[PDB]
């Protein structure tokens, strides 16, 4: 960084880089019969 240049000296920039993000894949899934209830109350699903 420039501040770190302002205070001491490093070698030349030899292993160059640039900031980037890390995050889950995440493989987030919940398929199956246990999904379809959602648009309506599971109790109300029974009253029907």
């Amino acid at each position: 960084t420039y501040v770190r240049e302002k205070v001491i000296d490093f070698s030349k920039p030899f292993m160059t880089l640039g900031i980037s993000i890390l995050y889950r894949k995440p493989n987030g899934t919940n398929p199956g019969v246990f999904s379809f209830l959602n648009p309506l109350s599971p109790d109300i699903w029974m009253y029907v």
């Binding site: 109350s41 109790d43 109300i44 009253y47």
Partner: peptide, 22 residues
């Protein structure tokens, strides 16, 4: 228990269903 307000408006027919008996 949100829209049960209509499982209960439902009753108006099951109440009305009595009359044609005579």
């Amino acid at each position: 228990q949100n829209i049960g307000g209509i499982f209960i408006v439902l009753a108006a027919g099951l109440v009305l269903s009595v009359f044609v008996a005579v």
